[PDB]
Amino acid sequence: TLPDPLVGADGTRVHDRATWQHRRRPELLQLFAREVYGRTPLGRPEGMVFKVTTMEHAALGGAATRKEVTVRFGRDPNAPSMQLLLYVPNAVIARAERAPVFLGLNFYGNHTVHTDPAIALSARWIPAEAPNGANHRATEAARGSDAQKWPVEQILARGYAVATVYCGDLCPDRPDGLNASVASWLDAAAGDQRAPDAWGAIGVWAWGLSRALDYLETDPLVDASRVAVHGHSRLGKAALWAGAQDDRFALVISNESGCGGAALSKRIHGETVARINTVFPHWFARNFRRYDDHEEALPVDQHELLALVAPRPLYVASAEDDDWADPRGEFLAVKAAEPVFRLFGQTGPSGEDVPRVNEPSGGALRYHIRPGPHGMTAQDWAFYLAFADEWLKSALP
Ligand SMILES: O=C(O)[C@H]1O[C@H](O)[C@H](O)[C@@H](O)[C@@H]1O
Ligand SMILES: [Mg+2]
Ligand code: NA
């Protein structure tokens, strides 16, 4: 039995949007920070610098303006940074209009999201599982190696810019990666051991998404008030945490994020807390290991993470064969967060059980399950683009 998002920690019921926004939301944010993801130690750091390193106005055969931007997290050239790739549809900026944006992290490098040979090859560590990796270094053969998750031309043709950053710029995805990450620079001080409530990879990845948004606020080609933050699987766990913590994100998409993302932990199905923390000990706070094989003691569940997006539109989606993510657990988290969305006048999926494949259900809180295995497909994207067209805040008053 799940904790009620609309009952505060002290037992008092949440009846109105102000109490939600100003009392219950901070309560839940601090529970997720302390017990699951670890504390985000600071939001925007002072002295962030944005350097456009390349700009091409006729990329993708004229369809897009492509920019590469180094986003450095302090003023000294020696502060850590991340490399942002942005494609903006020329049809939109040719009209003297700013484009809305889809923003998400990639798994294996910016050069993998499209074959475009002008994208800078990542100079960072790449995991062995990356396609066409050579001793954890990017190669020309990895270009476009993850393009199936990134239908850039369709996204642009529908009027959206595409922004992305390699998650490994922020925390390399390997158990020792926090030692060479934003986390190791952004405090800890003279200690070697990670604190119990210290953030892990998911928290650092989510922070980078918010830093990317900081950059989009200064870019005159895009409308940073109309940013849909999305991610697949482990990067969808980050996209949910980023969209929950940072209410500037206008729209949030979780593509099969599973355990510690959209899936209920207290439903014991597929991946469990013990399994995710054992295999990926750097992803969550050390404090999350308290709940290994003890999910009943969790003071929150992931439906309350989804509810932290409200009233902003949120899309949670599953794959039919993706038992590990627990599609039903993801759907039931949507249903358990729906009462918060309803508080703000929005509607969630119709019914109490998982919809049929390729039949999305819900208003501003939407769910679909698609056929096939874990992944992010053109079908997923088709549904996300329809959702953005409908619910991504307008450019008008
Ligand atoms: O990111 C992915 O592809 C997935 O990788 C692993 O399977 C992990 O157990 C999942 O939690 C994760 O979602
Ligand atoms: Mg599970
Ligand atoms: Na902008």
Numbering used by the authors: 35 to 431
What do the authors of the reporting publication say about this deposited model?
Glucuronyl esterases (GEs)4 are enzymes able to cleave ester linkages connecting lignin to glucuronoxylan in the plant cell wall. Here, we have investigated by mutagenesis the residues involved in catalysis and carbohydrate binding in the enzyme OtCE15A and, furthermore, present a series of structures of OtCE15A with different ligands, including monosaccharides and, for the first time in CE15, di- and oligosaccharides.
We determined the structure of the WT OtCE15A in complex with the product GlcA. Relative to the apo-structure previously determined, binding of GlcA resulted in minimal changes in the enzyme's structure (all atom root mean square deviation of 0.639 Å), and the binding of the uronic acid to OtCE15A is very similar to that seen in the structure of the fungal StGE2 (catalytic S213A variant) in complex with the methyl ester of 4-O-MeGlcA. The C5 carboxylate is oriented similarly to that observed in the StGE2 complex structure and makes a hydrogen bond to the main-chain nitrogen of a conserved active-site arginine (Arg-268 in OtCE15A and Arg-214 in StGE2), which, as for most α/β-hydrolases, is likely to contribute to forming the oxyanion hole to stabilize the negatively charged transition state during catalysis. A notable difference from the StGE2 complex structure, however, is that the side chain of the conserved arginine in OtCE15A is oriented toward the glucuronic acid and makes two additional hydrogens bonds: one between O5 of the pyranose ring and one of the arginine's Nη atoms and one between the carboxylate and the arginine's Nϵ. Thus, this side chain almost certainly contributes to formation of the oxyanion hole.
